[PDB]
Design a protein around this ligand. Structure first.
Ligand code: PEB
Ligand code: PUB
Ligand code: PEB
Ligand code: PEB
Ligand code: PEB
Ligand code: PEB
Ligand code: PEB
Ligand code: PEB
Ligand code: PEB
Ligand code: PEB
Ligand code: PEB
Ligand code: PEB
Ligand code: PEB
Ligand code: PEB
Lengths: 177, 73, 164, 238, 177, 164, 177, 177
């Protein structure tokens, strides 16, 4: 994979230039809030197994056709697989939030997953909603406005990292659409 | 032909001469191969999606009663 | 690429597991010692054209037989390509001064280099004199800071350790 | 003309489309990786001891016709079992092609490349379940315990799959006995330099493909590498 | 197209035999009850408009997540595009019942209906329920056993045509799955 | 065990490589973060008999149904076996604060837990109330330091995410 | 496997005690010499290519009997494997210096190796002279007392790190001889 | 296509909520800062023909293998198409910046652009460079740091719009990769 450090390397490799002092100030500011990246992604992984139960059951109670007989979440093998990929997508978004770039997302998770859900009969219109509920939950845990659990963080601003994960779940939602 | 003419001289020529605008559509769908006779579906689910609107297109090949018109022969 | 991040994100993906507190702890090492190699980067990037003027002729200092006819460095434009050749390797160790691993080396500088030099007759045992000349040409309070020199020299003799 | 669903007489769009060319590039890397993984077996001019078909003149040709029917049964898989074969071979090849991002890049595109590498990389460092003969019944009962759990997805719900099946014709399965009985002896009568290269590579195979930082699973693999070479991917139902 | 008179004549053309009176026994029996079959097809066509409203609204009341957002019958364009193909299936099994052979069904309506419903994201498990209620509405109209509107008919058995039209509806069901 | 040290040695053994500066900088994370993860080490080890008693009955306060017969809290030696299990767990949480990673919890408490608790009729939701009561009773400047309270709670809700 | 931080866990799990103020003096000192330890591994990764050639040719200058026909350096295939496994045990002791314990040696290097070397025809007398000569090459790099190559470092005593690698080499040189 | 107003409507349609007072804050500031968006598009579309020639002359002087005999920019039949696709992308990015959503960009242009440039033999690793020069010009013209032409603007800040068009050229860069 790559990260936010190696993203400006392979962009400068295309022009074969040394990364001087001019373009590293995007990464000089990145290591200044490297504690903030760890203080944001720790809120996700501590509530990771409770976010996918908050999202799949939020998908069922908004769209009850999946638990109809014959439907995509009716056989108890199938609900076990739907909760299996709830924590795979939440792993790979938190991989990309930790690395700072989404380059781990469209080669190990999002690569071929659109045609896989088409070939399995997975309803992708309700599968956006299971991702978008995780988008509203990861943006609540990072700015600590989650209305059942608050954590202990130093005061400041984290809207720059609230949109870092909000642009990653929508990268998942645009690739399987 | 009014919505593929570029300038207002060309859309004035398409209004006064209705036989010109018929072969103006036959100009644009031969320089850009957008006919059914050049349509190659890449897959079987796009082959069936082509046939979903040919059966609507054959429905104007007959009249509203059900008699075969002279346009499709 | 191998980085500090890209090892532990690939190691946790082997079991299909979440980023644990072990994995956030390895990122914390890539902040304090990141600024040590960062001030070695643009100091190398601001002075890259003068190192290859000293690292270029150092391969012809102790091996002056390259300009003999019958070998692969006989004309002037191959020496200009030889000056181009070491500037790629000094661009690659500038990249690991940013990413903190050996990522842009082991797929872009060593991978295949054992076979393109054995098939085009360029001596690797004489090529490593150019990089290892820059290893002891390092004045650790005059080039840069002190703790940059314990890792910038470590990247260079890794490249000595990779070709030979 | 219109489409074939209404009032036509011959099948059309016989043209090399994008998916056929994607299958055509992926078959050609399968004939390059299986070329390159056979280069470690036949490294000198002679064919090795383990590149053999059979012993009986009717059994060497029966190895191909079994394997030509074996590759049809991977094609005859269901849509759920094809997709679980798709991503699991993606995962086991990044563990195989470990340290390179370029070698990781190629397998994520080409899907039959993933089946070609992790079958051949198992047979390059000989971490297969056929090539290992355990030295005693201490190591054998460790090796006989793990593969019965690997046979536990040959029958997922107690009914057999097609991937575990070896008999395709009348009188077919008896050649499948004696081909592996001769393979068990040739692995036992292999060279002494190769068999201790087998146990060390198989115990290095299981610690990275299935242990993943577990102290207990690495300890049994370092005690019993014959059980490590019986560990395979779970996409193989057998 | 291959109808019931022309299904047998390509069977004899597979061996180039003259079709004789050993093979017209299936055909002269078929032409003898042809007044019953024309009494059978007319009972479907004369109730054909509400029969797709009897079935698609039967599909909604069994599974109310199709009209839920994320369902594939949610919006008013999509319910119009489901009632449009509610009646194409009933039109194409009245084409196979009148022709006495399902080789107008397997090529003019379902040659490629499997991958069409896959690539559009149409759920396969609910289109079985859309067509199986029309299976139970055919055999109530063939056997005159409709509990809300019975039609006047000449007396006699009609149990073969009810088995034939139910053997056309499962070929719709076994192909779109 | 899975720790910061044990990951990068297995990553270098997978590549067949020496520990380079990507693996070298992971242990740099065990220099600044091990001052805070070991600050909460002896606070648990010096007070392990206090946390087990007034959180082990908080299991039984939320679930008082176990005192009926047929259940797990039906006699006193079963309750004496019940306080041993959360004393086992907080020993393992202290074992993972001193190791850096989540190794001793994974190798000894979580692996195989989902097979024993289903057959022995032990509710894992009754386990998780005793674990999670220690999380929100924890005061940030009083029980330990500020960063140690983030660190000790992060290993605590991993076990909550392990059992659920 | 184990390490140094995991050794005090299993020493405390050997009696099921806790890790308190008794066992932490070895571990609160371990972070203080961590910057000595990370500078010791950086010394040994810098120069591994010659110090195996310092060892496998120093084995030649005291024992030329393997270049004698029938030895173990007569073949160019076998001379690669003496160079390939001369650095693997050097790679494993540099693993052990980073781990603070020789736990990776008794499963990945030591166990099986005596039963390996009888089945190869390995001279056991070549084993002890190879490791002990590169033992003195190892501590010359650690204590910076290498008499043809110097290095820049931070000042302080380092013989505790020189004795820790001296406790590793006599392990692997004992059982396989 | 969809635009920036229709992006939050189809997000509020999947949950079937009304457009409330919390999701309208992203739009009611999109109006007030949208008067700078018309000043952002008008700086790009005024320099449109000289931007696409600036890029491909930068592509030839960095990659001189395209003007090789047989190369992919050899003839004037091929160089007219490379100047055509250079301005098809700048036409569609200027629709994406003007609408504020990337929806019009990646359904008329980018869906199928990857396998097209495989099937023509267009080199990916130089067309990445060609669109990245057009990335570097659009982030110069919007904040008016284009170093041979300044344009008249009211004083203020446009680093929100400078990052939005920088988030659109790499969407082309993620498509053809
Ligand atoms: C049924 C129709 C229905 C639900 C079920 C429920 C699901 C839901 N919840 C949110 C918002 C949040 N969900 C969160 C998840 C959890 N809360 C917790 O504290 C734990 C960790 C976890 C459950 C185990 C969180 C943190 C939030 C944010 C608010 C907060 O502080 O709790 C949504 C999103 C709503 C939206 O999209 O606007 C949904 C669907 N809600 C239901 O309506
Ligand atoms: C699937 C992987 C299987 C499991 C699990 C299993 O126990 N056996 C595999 C399938 C299977 N095969 C039979 C019947 C036969 N199997 C034969 C193969 C053996 N012969 C060999 O040379 C080897 C390699 C060591 C093996 C395993 C043979 C021969 C037969 C008999 C065929 C015949 O005589 O016609 C069965 C049992 C079902 C049955 O009807 O016997 C199963 C489950
Ligand atoms: C926005 C997401 C949050 C918020 C974040 C902040 N965190 C800040 C500081 C901070 N966080 C940590 C812990 C972090 N570092 C690690 O090494 C690991 C795990 C291994 C983690 C989780 C540390 C050490 C620090 C530095 C200060 C300290 O010692 O606690 C922070 C202050 C800026 C800074 O100093 O970095 C902010 C703003 N705060 C918020 O208000 C929201 C909710
Ligand atoms: C759950 C929120 C979804 C849903 C999910 C289902 N997925 C099913 C199978 C399946 N899921 C994935 C996704 C995941 N696994 C991976 O390995 C990776 C990438 C590395 C990802 C993203 C895959 C690949 C597969 C196929 C393999 C398999 O079957 O395990 C599934 C079972 C279908 C069936 O049994 O026929 C379901 C139900 N479905 C839903 O309704 C919601 C939207
Ligand atoms: C309703 C009971 C279904 C359902 C139906 C939908 N079909 C949609 C499009 C569509 N439907 C057909 C079926 C039919 N029409 C034909 O012309 C032929 C063959 C000649 C058949 C069998 C086709 C081919 C198509 C694609 C072409 C088209 O647009 O008509 C549709 C619209 C989806 C959308 O707008 O995105 C719906 C909702 N879907 C259901 O959920 C139930 C099961
Ligand atoms: C004895 C084996 C050596 C020697 C060792 C010492 N090293 C000392 C300090 C030191 N080394 C480093 C760099 C190292 N730490 C890292 O985190 C990384 C990579 C990520 C590396 C390469 C640092 C940062 C330090 C601390 C001082 C500084 O900032 O430079 C040291 C001083 C004692 C101590 O710091 O504890 C010693 C004795 N020195 C020798 O002379 C022999 C050869
Ligand atoms: C220049 C930046 C490239 C390059 C371009 C070439 N493209 C060629 C054909 C071609 N290009 C496109 C892309 C573009 N045209 C469109 O109409 C649309 C969408 C509306 C887009 C994105 C298309 C579709 C085609 C096929 C149509 C045609 O025949 O022109 C082309 C000709 C190849 C040839 O003649 O052999 C070239 C040279 N190629 C390059 O090397 C640079 C990177
Ligand atoms: C069809 C697609 C395709 C690939 C992706 C590669 C993958 C690949 N590489 C090698 C073989 C090799 N691969 C590499 C490459 C690397 N080793 C490293 O240590 C670096 C991290 C990395 C560069 C990124 C090297 C150096 C060899 C030869 C020695 C070895 O096997 O390690 C082999 C076995 C053949 C052999 O033994 O030579 C295969 C299948 N080859 C292919 O045909
Ligand atoms: C890289 C070099 C390379 C080779 C030398 C050949 C190796 C090879 N594979 C098979 C033949 C086979 N090889 C396998 C593979 C396996 N069986 C298992 O149980 C494991 C999961 C897996 C790796 C050991 C299978 C399933 C067959 C067909 C059945 C069989 O004969 O075992 C045969 C025919 C002889 C026989 O086994 O009966 C040979 C020579 N293929 C290669 O790719
Ligand atoms: C939730 C909504 C909902 C529905 C729409 C129906 C759907 C429906 N209809 C029938 C069953 C039937 N449906 C019809 C169809 C019709 N009947 C007529 O009299 C007309 C001619 C025509 C509508 C124009 C017929 C003829 C039967 C057979 C029984 C009968 O009505 O005589 C059946 C099977 C038997 C049954 O349970 O009734 C079902 C599920 N049921 C529901 O629960
Ligand atoms: C003969 C020797 C022998 C082994 C070495 C193991 C190896 C092993 N583990 C698992 C099965 C498993 N292995 C693990 C792994 C672990 N579980 C933990 O508690 C740790 C964290 C980690 C060990 C380091 C897990 C979580 C499963 C269950 C999920 C899975 O199937 O992978 C399986 C599949 C069949 C089964 O469930 O048993 C096998 C063969 N089992 C054996 O029979
Ligand atoms: C290793 C972790 C660690 C701890 C948990 C504490 C140890 C500790 N202190 C208290 C005890 C206490 N803890 C608090 C603190 C608080 N109570 C509140 O209502 C506030 C929310 C919060 C202040 C921030 C108070 C006020 C008491 C005394 C009252 C009581 O809980 O019995 C208790 C429970 C009752 C008891 O046994 O005394 C424990 C286990 N020290 C440590 O080193
Ligand atoms: C028979 C043939 C023969 C040789 C090939 C050399 C090889 C050799 N070198 C050393 C001894 C050593 N060898 C090295 C290795 C090296 N030294 C460096 O400065 C480089 C970094 C690196 C070469 C790449 C080191 C560091 C020592 C310790 C002394 C020192 O060099 O300062 C020893 C041990 C001496 C002893 O203890 O008796 C031997 C046998 N000597 C021989 O007698
Ligand atoms: C070898 C050939 C070669 C070239 C032709 C130039 C082309 C060129 N210009 C720019 C960089 C740029 N290019 C332009 C484009 C233009 N400037 C204008 O004012 C006009 C509208 C338009 C020329 C008609 C602009 C506006 C910038 C940003 C900087 C600036 O000019 O202020 C870049 C990207 C940055 C870089 O890689 O250097 C390139 C490749 N450079 C080269 O290396």
């Amino acid at each position: 994979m790559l990260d936010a450090f190696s993203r400006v390397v392979v962009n400068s490799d295309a022009k074969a230039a040394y990364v001087g002092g001019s373009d590293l100030q995007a990464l000089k500011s990145f290591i200044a809030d490297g504690n903030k990246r760890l203080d944001a992604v720790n809120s996700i992984v501590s509530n990771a197994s409770c976010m996918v139960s908050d999202a799949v059951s939020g998908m069922i109670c908004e769209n009850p056709g999946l638990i109809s007989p014959g439907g995509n979440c009716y056989t108890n093998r199938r609900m076990a697989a739907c909760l299996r990929d709830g924590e795979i997508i939440l792993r790979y978004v938190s991989y990309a939030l930790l690395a700072g770039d989404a380059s781990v997302l469209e080669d190990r998770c999002l690569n071929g997953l659109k045609e896989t859900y088409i070939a399995l009969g997975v309803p992708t219109n309700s599968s956006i909603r299971a991702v978008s509920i995780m988008k509203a939950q990861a943006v609540a845990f990072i700015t600590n406005t989650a209305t059942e659990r608050k954590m202990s963080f130093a005061a400041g601003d984290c809207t720059s990292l609230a949109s870092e994960v909000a642009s990653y779940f929508d990268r998942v939602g645009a690739a399987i659409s | 032909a009014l919505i593929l003419a570029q300038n207002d001289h060309q859309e004035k020529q398409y209004i006064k001469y209705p036989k010109l605008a018929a072969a103006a559509l036959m100009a644009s769908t031969e320089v850009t191969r957008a006919c059914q006779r050049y349509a190659v579906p890449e897959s079987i689910e796009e082959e069936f999606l082509a046939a979903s609107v040919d059966k609507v297109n054959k429905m104007r090949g007959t009249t509203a009663s059900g008699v075969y018109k002279s346009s499709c022969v | 690429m191998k980085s500090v991040i890209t090892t532990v994100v690939s190691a946790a993906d082997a079991a299909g597991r979440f980023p644990s507190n072990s994995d956030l702890e390895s990122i914390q090492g890539n902040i304090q010692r990141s600024a040590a190699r960062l001030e070695a980067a643009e100091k190398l990037a601001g002075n890259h054209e003068a190192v290859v003027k000293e690292a270029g002729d150092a391969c012809f200092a102790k091996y002056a037989y390259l300009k003999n006819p019958g070998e692969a460095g006989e004309n002037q434009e191959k020496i200009n390509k030889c000056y181009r050749d070491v500037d790629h390797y000094m661009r690659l160790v500038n990249y690991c001064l940013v990413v903190g691993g050996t990522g842009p080396l082991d797929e872009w500088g060593i991978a295949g280099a054992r076979e393109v030099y054995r098939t085009l007759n360029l001596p690797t045992s004489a090529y490593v004199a150019s990089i290892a000349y820059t290893r002891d040409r390092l004045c650790v309070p005059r080039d840069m800071s002190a703790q940059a020199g314990v890792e910038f020299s470590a990247y260079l003799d890794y490249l000595i350790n990779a070709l030979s | 003309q219109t489409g074939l669903v209404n009032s036509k007489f011959s099948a059309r769009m016989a043209k090399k489309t994008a998916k056929q060319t994607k299958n055509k590039v992926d078959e050609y890397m399968a004939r390059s990786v299986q070329r390159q993984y056979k280069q470690a077996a036949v490294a000198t001019g002679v064919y090795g001891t383990q590149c053999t078909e059979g012993t009986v003149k009717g059994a060497a040709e029966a190895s191909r016709s079994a394997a030509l029917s074996r590759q049809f049964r991977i094609k005859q898989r269901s849509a759920f079992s094809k997709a679980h074969d798709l991503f699991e071979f993606r995962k086991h090849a990044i563990i195989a092609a470990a340290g390179c991002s370029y070698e990781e890049k190629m397998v994520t595109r080409f899907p039959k490349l993933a089946a070609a590498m992790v079958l051949g990389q198992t047979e390059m460092m000989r971490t297969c379940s056929r090539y290992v003969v355990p030295e005693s019944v201490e190591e054998e009962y460790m090796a006989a315990s793990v593969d019965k759990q690997m046979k536990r997805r040959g029958a997922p719900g107690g009914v057999y799959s097609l991937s575990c099946a070896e008999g395709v014709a009348k009188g077919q399965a008896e050649i499948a006995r004696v081909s592996a009985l001769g393979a068990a002896y040739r692995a036992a009568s292999k060279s002494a330099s190769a068999v201790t290269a087998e146990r060390y590579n198989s115990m290095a195979y299981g610690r990275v493909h299935f242990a993943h930082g577990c102290s207990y699973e690495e300890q049994q693999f370092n005690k019993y590498p014959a059980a490590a070479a019986a560990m395979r991917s779970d996409s193989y139902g057998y």
